[PDB]
Ligand SMILES: C[C@H]1Cn2c(nnc2C(F)(F)F)CN1C(=O)c1cccc(C(F)(F)c2n[nH]c(=O)c3ccccc23)c1
């Protein structure tokens with residue numbers, strides 16, 4: 001079903017992924033409570049996820065999205081942090097696990113900031129942290145995140161995403177726009193699992209500042 005291909009640290013692809021991961025780090029409102037306190041990652045390994053069935057579904061949907069949006073599928077590389085990596089790399093993203101609540105809408109969420117996704121590696125609010133030390137700011141335990149191909153199509157920009165079950169008419173995605181009375185960092189939402197491909201699996205550690 002799924003095959004992982006190791007990228008060499010000296011390869012252009014690995015370097016591109018690491019630089020996007022490192023450059024998108026930001027200071028979060030919670031002062032590092034959910035994701036830990038760091039200004040750098042120590043990248044352990046980067047793997048390319050190979051899943052035939054997932055690629056088929058992704059490519060088929062991309063063709064549809066572009067055919068609806070004047071031949072522009074608007075593909076974006078976005079981060080996804082989750083304690084359910086294994087399920088995602090084998091089954092893909094699934095909007096059926098999502099629902100309307102006080103924090104999120106019924107969708108598949110992505111960040112353009114790696115540090116935002118890092119806040120969800122151990123669950124909502126960082127859960128209880130690493131299973132070994134129960135520390136949300138663990139500098140030892142190897143963390144994992146995904147760097148995904150996301151078919152955005154025509155995106156709808158809005159201040160709040162909690163009431164969304166699908167994109168508005170003629171749109172394919174929703175973007176939670178940063179605001180003074182809202183989000184500090186952008187949220188990217190799709191409502192179909194076929195609109196994302198979990199391309200890269202990043203294994204890393206957060207680094208403790210000097
Ligand atoms: C239903 C879940 C789990 N989910 C999905 N597909 N399969 C599953 C699973 F049940 F198997 F885990 C798709 N899904 C998500 O996308 C999702 C939905 C709501 C909230 C979150 C999140 F809060 F946990 C989150 N995580 N990771 C981020 O990088 C992130 C970036 C910006 C904002 C919020 C977040 C994720």
Ligand SMILES: [Zn+2]
Nearest residue numbers: 130133138141
């Ligand atoms: Zn730990």
